[PDB]
Amino acid sequence: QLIAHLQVFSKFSNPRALYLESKLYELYLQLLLHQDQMVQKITLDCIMTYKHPHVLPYRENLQRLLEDRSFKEEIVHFSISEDNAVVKTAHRADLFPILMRILYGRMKNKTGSKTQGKSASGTRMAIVLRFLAGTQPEEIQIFLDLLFEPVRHFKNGECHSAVIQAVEDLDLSKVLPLGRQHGILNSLEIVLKNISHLISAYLPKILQILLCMTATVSHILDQREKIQLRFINPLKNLRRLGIKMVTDIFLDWESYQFRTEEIDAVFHGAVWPQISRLGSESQYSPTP
Amino acid sequence: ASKGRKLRFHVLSKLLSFMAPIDHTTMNDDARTELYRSLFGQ
Amino acid sequence: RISGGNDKQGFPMKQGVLTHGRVRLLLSERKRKSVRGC
Amino acid sequence: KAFIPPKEKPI
Amino acid sequence: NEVKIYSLIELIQDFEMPTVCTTIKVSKDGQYILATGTYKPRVRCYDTYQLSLKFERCLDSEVVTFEILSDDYSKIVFLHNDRYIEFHSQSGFYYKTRIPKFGRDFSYHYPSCDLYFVGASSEVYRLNLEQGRYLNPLQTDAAENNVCDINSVHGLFATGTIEGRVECWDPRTRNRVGLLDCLPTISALKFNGALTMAVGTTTGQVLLYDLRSDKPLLVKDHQYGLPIKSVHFQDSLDLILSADSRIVKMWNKNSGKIFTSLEPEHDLNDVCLYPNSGMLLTANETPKMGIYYIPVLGPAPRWCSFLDNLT
Amino acid sequence: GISRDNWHKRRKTGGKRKPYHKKRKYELGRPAANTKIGPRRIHTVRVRGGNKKYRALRLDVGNFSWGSECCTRKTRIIDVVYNASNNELVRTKTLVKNCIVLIDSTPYRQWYESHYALPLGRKKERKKNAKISSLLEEQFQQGKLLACIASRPGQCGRADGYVLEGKELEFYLRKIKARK
Amino acid sequence: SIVMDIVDDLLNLPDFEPTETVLNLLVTGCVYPITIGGR
Amino acid sequence: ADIQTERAYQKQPTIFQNKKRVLLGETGKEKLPRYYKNIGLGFKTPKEAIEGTYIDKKCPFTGNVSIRGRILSGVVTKMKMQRTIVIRRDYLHYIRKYNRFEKRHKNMSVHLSPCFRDVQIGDIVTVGECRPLSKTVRFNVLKVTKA
RNA sequence: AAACUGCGAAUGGCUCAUUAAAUCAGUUAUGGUUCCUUUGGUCGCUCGCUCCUUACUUGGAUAACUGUGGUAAUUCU
RNA sequence: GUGGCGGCGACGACCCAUUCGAACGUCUGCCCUAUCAACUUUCGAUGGUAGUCGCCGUGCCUACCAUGGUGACCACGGGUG
């Protein structure tokens, strides 16, 4: 039913003259991140009705990006690096919003010939992030905003305050899904690996997001009598990955200046919940 | 001389009488001689 | 719409060929069949 | 002799 | 830019190489059109009257260029990157022989039955057809010789060199009549008429040269740096036909005004013009072979007479 | 027809043999795949036993390995500079095995500043060892790397290889300057 | 290995000195019960 | 001397020689690790194969060949071609009709690795069978004993 | 019945038009390759943003069939 | 209850082994002729490096190198209901 509505609007000559054309545009922008391959294509043509001077010359490359057979070829031959670029410098501002949300949809659903299924989620996202390595730090932040959309509430407030209030504002009846949270950490791990040279400005809020879940995940791990047994093992895996990235972030960025609130926050959610029982677990194998 | 690296002038039987000489040149022989002496800066 | 036809010798016409007369094309392992122009 | 180049005379 | 070019339903069936087409050429009578292509190097001849392929003959090696000796399709010579020349009679393969060094391009002198090899040797090999024996070698004293052409007007043989020097020879008496001096390599060289010559350069400049004056009559520079593979001449409209891989340009011989330009979807290996017609045949790096018809340039060819009604 | 038989060859002592049979199907030969630089164009070939051979005719990209740093990245192919067998493959820009090519240096560079956080190519517990010889550093300053192909495009259909380094790089650079 | 590694590096590694563009971290605890690591 | 005498770089295939290291290990010695194998059947690898530096893919000890089949012996007769020698094997052919013998010989071209040096004309050589290394060579030298 | 699909026709016959290690006999190797069929193994899924309520099974065609025909002419079309 | 479990067969299917094989090698051994004593490099003869092609090893072939290989213990050539 959604496709039928989109086809008729794609055949309109002048979308600007249409009534309430303003609200239509972000709906087309919102439908760009769609997971279905058919939805993304018909969405693109509605945007192309707006014959904006910048986006129009790069029409063909965008369509071939939506084709499963020709996806992997266009990633190489649509370079956006400053040294060598097909897109011009003046045209970077307009094209990138359209390019980002299209790639976000390809990351979730299908990012190549053989890249489908849950097991390939690491490979699909990794190809996308390598392609975005050539961008500027102001260009990259658009993609990270979409990537970390469900965890925006952890960003607000100071680092130590957010950690404490997250623990207090925790209900066993309603939590963020564990499987989706597992995807977020796998999202975060690969991001810090490859675009670390473009992550310095956004790094402090990453520490806010990373510490907030780790403080929360340990809190349920305390209240095991009220939770199902099947949930215990995924929660353990989430805590293990959370410490490792904190371990990795502390390992690098040697010259980075950590504020006092940051040092308070890392002890609240990582060190203190497990420091007392360190003699029990570490003997078999080194704990995170 | 290996692999025909050196030119040889043995008779080739299959190429013998492969074509017949046909000539269509309008310019006369005396005119040809004068032109070549006059070619370029010469 | 002109779907096809046969000339006075019974040969059919083909879409691709553009001639007033008959030609000898390769038709379906292909043989030289004679076909009328379109 | 196989490498000797033959000579022609202008007729 | 008011030419409004057409692109072509199917004039000749199976006018398609498997992957790519290297060279397309037309017989002098105009009834036969010959093409060669990768993969499985083929010789495919298309009948203009029948609008179909007469035959296909696969080859051992890819053919750099082939030249039609006979008036009909009967006798043809192929030069290979494997140093091999293969002769094909009317029935099929007839004889094969090699040359010591690789041959870039070859030209055949119809008088004296002498066929010339220009290649990766300073010496230019000569082949007599009436007598099987290879003729005496001629030394062009330049390291690499790239292109050659023979003028039908008065029989002048000129070979291009790697240094950018054009050297003219005499087919009779085997003497170097003169030299022409002009880093860029000679991409394309063509003889048109008695006194007009053209040289293409790898930088993308096609230069008009006159025999008596060393200075060029006119200069035309392609803005793109790609070399110009083939240059042709059209006598009726006084147009010089310049082709490179990115684009092919139509321009007047005098004052160098541009007639029109044609850019196809993928690069052009070779370009050909049917005699006395506006129809243009191009060889591309695509299974389909380009056919383009220019009404203003000339009328439709006789075996495609109905196009004028269709326009 | 291309035959790779043995009975057309002269004998060890020098005598010739008269054939007792004509060419067999299992002795066939096929025209060479002269892979050029251009848009990806490949053709599949059916072989003995029903298997497939991928015959690459035109290639532009392939993955290459930084062996000392152990970083494998997929990069475009730029040009052909040297060939051990013949100079004609260099002139015609033909891809065969063990030929030396030029490849883009962007992915290795990006990985380098993403890993060591130390600048590279810019104009004027065992710890991480960020050290690069002068030759490779000047190569990144030029923006292109020299690579050696290890696969056969005519058989597998892809161009894979490794970035030249060390005394092999020095030898091939000396050859490249010597040929000019 | 890990614990023995932790002990040794606290022993044989000199105290951090402030340098340009890097300033020592401020810790609220700072209980601090020879080099700093030996303490 | 120098091992790089051909147009292409001569490298022992199974050895990776571009491994980066610290400057302390670089200052010590630039000695490439050598690859060698025991061919079995009681034959011992000569020490020159272990300590040498020659590049030969057809060496039974340092190359990619396998010794299997017949192990034969002969006398070295000709040393003129590169890394290969000509040997002779003598025997007697028996005639039943005359109940007597006749002298016969066989000539064999076998591959000689550089690890065997000081080899003169007329010493005993024992060779082993491998795959056809060329049009006429199918055996590799395994041991040389002086006359 | 007709048609669609699968398998075989490369074996056995028959036969006047080539050949000194080229074939052939015995031994020997597959660690240098190919294989329809016979026989024996192997042939399951934790989570991993695809959301809310096709795996009780998903899409597009074409012969046989009905009917209109052309030519000296195929069961050609 | 758009519950949950199920037998014996048919066909197809990735890979390993096996059978039927097929294909290149190793060794051993062929009739007459010296009034055929030298042959091979007469489009490579011997080998080295790199490559194309091939089911794979290989002058099988192509580029760049050395000058090699066989022979009176009969090479090579010619014959032989």
Side-chain angles (χ1 to χ4, degrees), chain A residues 1-134 137 150 157 162 166 177 179 183 201 204 215 234 242 265 269-270 273 279 286 288, chain B, chain C, chain D residues 2 5-6 10, chain E, chain F, chain G residues 14 18 29 33 37-38, chain H:
Chain A
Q1 312 288 327
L2 186 86
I3 298 296
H5 293 75
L6 292 173
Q7 293 179 356
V8 297
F9 276 75
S10 302
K11 285 159 211 82
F12 281 157
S13 303
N14 192 358
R16 318 216 190 252
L18 270 46
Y19 176 48
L20 192 66
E21 61 93 21
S22 50
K23 285 184 180 178
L24 268 292
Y25 199 90
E26 69 275 16
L27 191 70
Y28 299 162
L29 273 174
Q30 188 176 1
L31 283 180
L32 282 175
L33 64 93
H34 202 276
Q35 303 157 352
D36 183 14
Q37 201 279 330
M38 201 65 248
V39 172
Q40 275 184 297
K41 287 181 74 172
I42 195 63
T43 299
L44 192 59
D45 309 283
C46 306
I47 294 175
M48 295 298 102
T49 55
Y50 302 77
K51 292 181 178 65
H52 177 83
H54 293 175
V55 60
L56 186 78
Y58 311 98
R59 194 178 147 150
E60 278 70 12
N61 307 63
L62 292 203
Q63 306 218 99
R64 300 180 230 135
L65 279 188
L66 296 183
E67 303 321 307
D68 288 332
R69 171 169 43 180
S70 66
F71 181 80
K72 291 183 178 180
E73 317 183 59
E74 303 320 318
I75 301 300
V76 176
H77 308 315
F78 196 36
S79 297
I80 57 172
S81 178
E82 295 83 4
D83 291 346
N84 180 290
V86 186
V87 62
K88 307 157 215 89
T89 71
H91 298 85
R92 275 192 160 122
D94 291 331
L95 277 296
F96 281 4
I98 315 293
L99 191 44
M100 285 326 96
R101 322 153 80 81
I102 281 160
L103 291 190
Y104 191 78
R106 294 296 92 196
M107 183 278 288
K108 295 196 271 173
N109 183 260
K110 190 173 181 179
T111 316
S113 67
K114 290 184 179 179
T115 59
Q116 67 272 16
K118 281 179 222 182
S119 66
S121 186
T123 304
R124 294 198 301 269
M125 182 180 72
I127 287 157
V128 177
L129 295 173
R130 302 262 180 72
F131 171 79
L132 271 72
Chain B
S2 300
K3 302 178 183 180
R5 277 173 184 96
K6 289 306 296 176
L7 196 66
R8 295 175 186 180
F9 310 109
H10 304 283
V11 186
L12 302 177
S13 304
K14 285 173 280 298
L15 290 175
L16 173 64
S17 73
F18 188 71
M19 301 295 208
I22 183 63
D23 273 8
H24 299 293
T25 313
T26 64
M27 191 205 268
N28 194 18
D29 78 8
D30 59 334
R32 304 172 197 179
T33 60
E34 300 164 13
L35 174 65
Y36 291 145
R37 311 294 323 286
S38 62
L39 275 193
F40 306 107
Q42 316 157 2
Chain C
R1 186 192 70 197
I2 302 177
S3 182
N6 274 2
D7 63 341
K8 296 179 179 176
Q9 273 67 52
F11 292 97
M13 319 191 292
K14 222 179 187 303
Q15 183 67 75
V17 60
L18 183 85
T19 306
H20 293 266
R22 287 197 300 264
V23 295
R24 296 188 66 184
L25 297 202
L26 296 169
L27 307 188
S28 302
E29 294 86 3
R30 295 202 301 174
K31 281 179 295 181
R32 285 226 163 254
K33 308 293 289 303
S34 300
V35 297
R36 169 69 155 79
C38 84
Chain E
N1 195 359
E2 316 294 298
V3 174
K4 188 268 183 181
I5 185 64
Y6 295 99
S7 303
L8 322 171
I9 310 292
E10 177 74 331
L11 277 296
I12 297 185
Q13 70 174 177
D14 287 332
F15 206 67
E16 291 176 352
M17 295 298 102
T19 80
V20 292
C21 200
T22 316
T23 63
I24 58 171
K25 272 173 198 233
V26 181
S27 177
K28 296 183 290 294
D29 314 330
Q31 57 184 354
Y32 296 116
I33 305 175
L34 281 72
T36 55
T38 294
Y39 192 51
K40 305 170 186 179
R42 286 160 167 96
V43 188
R44 285 173 63 169
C45 188
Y46 301 91
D47 291 331
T48 57
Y49 307 120
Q50 275 75 27
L51 314 166
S52 63
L53 62 92
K54 195 184 200 65
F55 61 86
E56 58 90 10
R57 295 204 276 264
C58 290
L59 299 150
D60 302 355
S61 297
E62 201 287 328
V63 54
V64 186
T65 187
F66 79 111
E67 190 277 331
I68 173 65
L69 320 165
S70 170
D71 292 355
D72 291 330
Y73 74 106
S74 304
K75 304 252 171 283
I76 45 182
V77 169
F78 304 93
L79 183 63
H80 293 281
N81 55 3
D82 294 8
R83 295 168 40 189
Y84 265 121
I85 297 89
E86 179 174 5
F87 304 93
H88 274 227
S89 64
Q90 199 176 11
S91 178
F93 162 77
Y94 179 64
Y95 172 71
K96 189 169 53 177
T97 177
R98 78 178 71 254
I99 301 299
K101 291 247 190 164
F102 296 82
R104 316 301 186 181
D105 187 333
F106 75 97
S107 187
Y108 168 71
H109 194 41
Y110 289 82
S112 304
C113 301
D114 295 335
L115 193 140
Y116 292 80
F117 301 146
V118 169
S121 170
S122 309
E123 183 272 342
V124 162
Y125 300 102
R126 306 181 58 246
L127 182 63
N128 207 327
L129 277 296
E130 60 203 349
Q131 297 296 322
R133 283 82 58 84
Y134 295 173
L135 298 191
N136 288 32
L138 277 296
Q139 313 81 50
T140 63
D141 82 8
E144 190 276 331
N145 305 323
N146 186 25
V147 303
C148 58
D149 201 14
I150 301 182
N151 212 322
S152 301
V153 180
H154 58 85
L156 167 64
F157 173 71
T159 176
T161 67
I162 188 76
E163 307 101 350
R165 308 296 180 93
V166 178
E167 305 169 348
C168 295
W169 284 83
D170 205 14
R172 50 164 200 174
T173 74
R174 290 77 61 197
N175 292 115
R176 201 201 305 263
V177 65
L179 284 78
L180 192 163
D181 293 344
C182 63
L183 190 147
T185 310
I186 306 161
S187 186
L189 188 153
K190 184 183 184 295
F191 283 156
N192 168 59
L195 300 165
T196 304
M197 191 265 258
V199 163
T201 64
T202 183
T203 62
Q205 316 169 355
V206 64
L207 294 174
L208 271 163
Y209 293 101
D210 174 30
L211 300 191
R212 57 190 177 276
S213 173
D214 296 354
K215 303 300 174 58
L217 309 168
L218 286 176
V219 300
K220 187 65 182 292
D221 294 355
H222 291 43
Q223 72 277 18
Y224 292 175
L226 277 296
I228 296 169
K229 279 84 161 163
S230 178
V231 175
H232 292 351
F233 278 83
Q234 162 79 274
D235 58 356
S236 307
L237 284 189
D238 191 70
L239 286 182
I240 309 188
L241 296 175
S242 68
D244 68 276
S245 63
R246 179 66 179 86
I247 206 174
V248 56
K249 284 204 288 223
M250 296 299 102
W251 44 280
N252 193 22
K253 183 177 178 179
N254 301 341
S255 299
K257 66 203 63 54
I258 182 166
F259 190 70
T260 188
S261 290
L262 294 174
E263 56 178 2
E265 61 86 20
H266 188 193
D267 293 351
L268 303 93
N269 213 324
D270 190 32
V271 177
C272 187
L273 180 64
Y274 197 84
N276 300 353
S277 89
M279 182 179 72
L280 184 80
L281 302 165
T282 69
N284 295 278
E285 300 298 321
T286 311
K288 279 80 184 175
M289 293 182 286
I291 301 183
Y292 312 98
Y293 180 58
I294 313 163
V296 65
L297 171 64
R302 188 185 306 180
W303 51 278
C304 292
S305 185
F306 204 76
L307 310 154
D308 291 328
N309 290 318
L310 294 174
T311 59
Chain F
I2 310 180
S3 185
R4 53 192 316 275
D5 51 355
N6 189 359
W7 41 271
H8 87 286
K9 200 83 176 187
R10 278 187 167 271
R11 287 192 169 89
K12 174 190 175 180
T13 62
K16 58 185 303 296
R17 55 170 71 94
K18 294 183 297 180
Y20 70 99
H21 77 82
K22 312 165 187 180
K23 302 173 179 181
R24 266 61 190 288
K25 170 75 174 186
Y26 59 86
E27 303 173 343
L28 69 90
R30 295 195 183 95
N34 306 285
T35 305
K36 294 304 184 303
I37 297 89
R40 174 201 202 66
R41 297 295 301 279
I42 191 166
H43 186 270
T44 52
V45 175
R46 199 269 194 189
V47 298
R48 187 176 192 88
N51 310 95
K52 293 185 303 179
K53 270 184 184 177
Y54 300 88
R55 183 130 304 176
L57 272 299
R58 290 187 183 279
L59 294 175
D60 50 56
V61 298
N63 79 320
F64 293 88
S65 181
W66 202 359
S68 56
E69 191 67 24
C70 291
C71 174
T72 310
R73 285 298 180 274
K74 176 186 173 183
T75 182
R76 307 189 61 220
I77 307 180
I78 302 300
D79 204 298
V80 181
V81 287
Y82 179 72
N83 188 284
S85 300
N86 184 9
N87 199 3
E88 271 319 291
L89 311 173
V90 176
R91 191 193 70 82
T92 58
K93 273 72 186 175
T94 301
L95 280 76
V96 294
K97 180 177 170 55
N98 268 352
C99 78
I100 313 300
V101 296
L102 271 169
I103 62 170
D104 189 358
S105 300
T106 299
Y108 303 136
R109 182 182 60 81
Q110 291 182 353
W111 186 91
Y112 191 90
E113 292 84 4
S114 180
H115 186 273
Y116 295 100
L118 188 153
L120 181 154
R122 296 293 186 270
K123 300 289 94 176
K124 198 176 180 179
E125 63 277 12
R126 297 298 91 199
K127 44 187 172 300
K128 304 169 173 290
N129 182 32
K131 62 97 173 181
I132 291 170
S133 64
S134 66
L135 310 174
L136 301 153
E137 194 49 32
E138 190 276 331
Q139 288 210 61
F140 292 102
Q141 298 280 333
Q142 212 174 349
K144 298 172 295 300
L145 286 182
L146 277 296
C148 181
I149 184 167
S151 63
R152 305 149 68 178
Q155 310 287 328
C156 64
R158 55 182 80 181
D160 298 352
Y162 51 89
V163 183
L164 287 178
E165 284 181 348
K167 54 184 176 292
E168 268 195 330
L169 172 58
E170 180 284 321
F171 186 19
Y172 283 166
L173 279 171
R174 185 169 72 259
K175 279 297 178 178
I176 290 175
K177 279 73 176 175
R179 297 293 299 274
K180 306 171 183 174
Chain H
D2 192 22
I3 50 177
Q4 310 297 324
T5 52
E6 315 284 352
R7 298 188 57 179
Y9 185 82
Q10 302 297 100
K11 185 185 59 178
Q12 194 172 7
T14 186
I15 296 296
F16 175 51
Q17 63 185 359
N18 289 328
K19 182 179 184 293
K20 71 173 185 174
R21 53 191 176 183
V22 300
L23 300 185
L24 294 180
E26 181 180 354
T27 313
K29 181 54 186 179
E30 295 83 2
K31 180 67 174 66
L32 295 175
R34 195 90 164 115
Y35 166 79
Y36 61 97
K37 65 182 176 187
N38 188 3
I39 75 174
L41 300 180
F43 294 89
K44 42 192 179 181
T45 302
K47 305 301 105 185
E48 212 189 334
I50 305 178
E51 187 170 16
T53 179
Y54 65 96
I55 298 301
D56 190 15
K57 61 181 183 180
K58 301 177 182 176
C59 170
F61 311 102
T62 62
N64 196 40
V65 292
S66 181
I67 292 301
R68 81 292 183 276
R70 304 178 184 267
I71 307 295
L72 302 185
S73 179
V75 289
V76 173
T77 45
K78 280 187 301 180
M79 186 66 204
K80 287 182 178 303
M81 188 66 204
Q82 300 184 2
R83 287 175 171 176
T84 185
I85 62 170
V86 176
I87 70 170
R88 179 164 183 164
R89 307 177 63 251
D90 293 333
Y91 60 96
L92 295 174
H93 183 253
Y94 173 77
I95 306 292
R96 201 43 180 102
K97 178 177 182 175
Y98 305 98
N99 196 1
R100 281 170 166 83
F101 300 86
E102 68 183 353
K103 293 175 72 176
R104 293 195 181 186
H105 83 107
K106 282 290 182 61
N107 274 13
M108 272 275 278
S109 293
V110 293
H111 182 86
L112 182 64
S113 301
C115 51
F116 294 112
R117 295 182 295 170
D118 292 327
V119 181
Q120 309 304 297
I121 295 179
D123 48 4
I124 301 299
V125 58
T126 64
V127 297
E129 179 178 359
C130 59
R131 59 173 171 84
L133 306 180
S134 66
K135 181 187 175 186
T136 61
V137 178
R138 284 91 168 91
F139 280 73
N140 220 329
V141 166
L142 298 189
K143 184 173 74 175
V144 177
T145 70
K146 306 298 299 179

